Design a protein around this ligand. Sequence first.
Ligand SMILES: Nc1ncnc2c1ncn2[C@@H]1O[C@H](COP(=O)(O)OP(=O)(O)O)[C@@H](O)[C@H]1O
Ligand SMILES: O=P(O)(O)OC[C@H]1O[C@@H](O)[C@H](O)[C@@H](O)[C@@H]1O
Ligand SMILES: O=P(O)(O)OC[C@H]1O[C@@H](O)[C@H](O)[C@@H](O)[C@@H]1O
Ligand SMILES: OC[C@H]1O[C@H](O)[C@H](O)[C@@H](O)[C@@H]1O
Ligand SMILES: OC[C@H]1O[C@H](O)[C@H](O)[C@@H](O)[C@@H]1O
Length: 898
Amino acid sequence: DDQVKKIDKYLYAMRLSDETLIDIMTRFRKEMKNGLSRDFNPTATVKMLPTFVRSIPDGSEKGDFIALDLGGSSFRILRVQVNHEKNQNVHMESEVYDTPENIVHGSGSQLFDHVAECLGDFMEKRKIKDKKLPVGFTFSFPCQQSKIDEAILITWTKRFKASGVEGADVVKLLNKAIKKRGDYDANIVAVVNDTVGTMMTCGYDDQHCEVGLIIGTGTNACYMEELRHIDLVEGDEGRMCINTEWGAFGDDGSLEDIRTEFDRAIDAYSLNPGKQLFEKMVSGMYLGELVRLILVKMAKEGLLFEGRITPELLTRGKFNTSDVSAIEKNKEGLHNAKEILTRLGVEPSDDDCVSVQHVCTIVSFRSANLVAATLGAILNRLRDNKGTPRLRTTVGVDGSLYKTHPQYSRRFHKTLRRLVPDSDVRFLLSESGSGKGAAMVTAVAYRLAEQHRQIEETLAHFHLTKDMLLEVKKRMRAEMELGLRKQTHNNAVVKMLPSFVRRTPDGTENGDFLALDLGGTNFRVLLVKIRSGKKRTVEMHNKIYAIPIEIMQGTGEELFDHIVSCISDFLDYMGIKGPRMPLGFTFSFPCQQTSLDAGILITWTKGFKATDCVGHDVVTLLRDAIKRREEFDLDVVAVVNDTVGTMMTCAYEEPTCEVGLIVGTGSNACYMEEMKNVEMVEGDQGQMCINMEWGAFGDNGCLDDIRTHYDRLVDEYSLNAGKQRYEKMISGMYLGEIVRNILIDFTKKGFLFRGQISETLKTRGIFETKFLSQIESDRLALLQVRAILQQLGLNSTCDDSILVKTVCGVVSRRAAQLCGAGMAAVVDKIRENRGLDRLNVTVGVDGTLYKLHPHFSRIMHQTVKELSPKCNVSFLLSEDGSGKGAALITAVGVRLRT
Ligand SMILES: Nc1ncnc2c1ncn2[C@@H]1O[C@H](COP(=O)(O)OP(=O)(O)O)[C@@H](O)[C@H]1O
Ligand SMILES: O=P(O)(O)OC[C@H]1O[C@@H](O)[C@H](O)[C@@H](O)[C@@H]1O
Ligand SMILES: O=P(O)(O)OC[C@H]1O[C@@H](O)[C@H](O)[C@@H](O)[C@@H]1O
Ligand SMILES: OC[C@H]1O[C@H](O)[C@H](O)[C@@H](O)[C@@H]1O
Ligand SMILES: OC[C@H]1O[C@H](O)[C@H](O)[C@@H](O)[C@@H]1O
């Protein structure tokens, strides 16, 4: 009773009561919240690192894997087969590779060259060099990870200290070393901490496993946290394993009231002074050295060995944790103490053996007590997250100390269960090591990498490089020359049609005008009043009229009768009476004009298909319908494309506006060309607005090298197969169908919606301009995208929504770059043609996709700036629609009669 009692008093600060352990537990609860907080994480000692492992195994894992295991007492390489054969969950083979101190303490290159060489040997010996086995890496050090296949070393701990590795992605270092060998290929798909491999190994057997605990060379624990509490990982969805890195608890000085002179001494002379202070009071690397330090002081005070002190006793590292373990054995402990101490150079007495055994007891029991306190905090955290009175959970455990000391796991369990009386906790020893669990992570990581690879290969066909875009620009320019020249105009796909509008507004226009706006989303009738002079004004009124698809695709007589009925209504709606008014007809389809008021429809585009219209003068069609009604008369002065009316609407205020652009249902552009270049119209004086009809660019096969399988499908299923190919890669009627076709393919490949191609997904038109624009909105978090997808009729998850948003973005970004290339061609032609070093030009623009999409206009302006750097283009969105400009055109047309 005496000796032990006195030893108890000497090491009293090491004998922790439950009150102190509850205090430590509470401190650690606070650290865990600091490490998860976005605000305190940069200065949190307990890093709470995201692992990107979102679940314990579910039984679907299967495959043949390689697992590396580095940082614990032994470097192992394993081949793990999982459900690779019936009635064999797992099958493992393993090899330990000697890794001496000069490799662990040398350069990073030398360390990773060592790993790559042992891996080569391992694959060589088993002839698996050509199997393409996905590789998992258990690397037991704190790492910053933004994905499963990255592991940026934060700090070396334990025995390792290789230069050039802290702050580097060890997956890249390892890849580098393997490549340098040139001997074999290795696909490193996942990096995990050993706590995480332990939790996964144990979770394969026990579905309640939510914690992985290591009490070996070093000590650490991981646990399943809720995403809503993990501030540094986006999402509030589900769970994710957190690597606490609890060994650094106390590194800021918060456990200085628990630490003793011995702890300070072992810390000062370690590889990493001041760091991993909690770990140094607990793990196998340090407990025997803590005991040696205590014996040395005691000896110096004559409390042991009659003051005998040998140099062996004084040798750091000479008394290990295995000696502590042997000394604490029930029957042989004292005998083992005798032998061990005898080898120290002393001649220990029997009483010395009893004393030394008690010092081992106190050191190893304080460690067990400390880990019980920190693990108790994680269990209270899990209990709080689950929200129940009692906690049921399984802790997976590994580490030499826990596995080999004759009393530690028993004492740890008992203290743990006493500290957390509300939990029913099972401790499962991880007998297979981290490798099994690492393989389960590797199986899931490999499946997701394969799905990512195929998604990226599909989406890469929509990526356009700057050189490719310069080539599209060049092709547009060449097609513009083809359509303007007499010799080549008839077989040119970009028609470059004269509008007979020869100047922008000169400020003298004035009068009251009617206008029609047909071909976009809304058919409208308008009344426009323009007044010039002191303070010019424009006053406009309009009504929208529906045009059912049966009249858009019925007879020309029916369509024009319908337009005339709407005009009759609008005249009553406005109270218009009196002499017949001048009218400008915005008709957004390609027409061959012989003057401002005559336009023969060349072909239908978008969704129109009315019969007996193509090859007819549409002004004559309108005038015929007015005569059939025999009520009002009208003076149709002009037929205009919507590009041209949009340009004139903008040029009313801007002298630099010489270009019009539509990105709505369809896509097209117009611009002021020199009469000398307009070979199809006699005269070489002045300018003429040209309606490009650029939608048909590509209808001669000139964009076949960038059209995808999905563009081909959209055109093949369209109303005008083979026509308007460029427009079908850009505009609002067609982008949603490109997206829909990509989503169907991904759903069939099992990447989205559980492989379920619903009937909603098979319905054409679902990704309308409104919805595509909503899904990409920056200030719309997950819940709203899913809300939209679910609301359309699709069974979408958070991951589903993210992939849906990505696909939408790839398609709208390519449409905006393609539109940008065509616009870069037009502005450089104007610049180059006027012999200018720089051009300052305004483009009047309109269209629903352009107006509503969150990124299209920005991407498109950026593209034009990069592809035509000597042009400074300003894009001005019409507020008023094509109307103000159609009326301006009509005014000059009346004027030009006189
Ligand atoms: N909190 C503590 N810290 C350090 N040593 C302790 C502590 N509590 C008890 N001990 C010591 O642990 C030993 C008791 O071990 P215990 O696991 O409870 O029973 P057993 O004798 O079966 O191993 C005694 O040597 C006692 O002095
Ligand atoms: O440091 P140790 O004593 O080796 O214990 C910890 C080690 O246990 C082994 O079973 C695991 O496979 C390793 O991944 C782990 O690092
Ligand atoms: O097809 P949309 O989305 O309707 O866009 C194109 C249309 O935009 C309107 O603002 C113009 O006034 C119309 O003349 C033009 O045709
Ligand atoms: O090997 C057990 C533990 O040792 C150290 O504490 C490492 O920092 C940690 O990553 C690891 O899990
Ligand atoms: O409405 C925008 C454009 O749609 C189509 O591309 C029409 O062919 C064109 O004339 C019109 O400008």
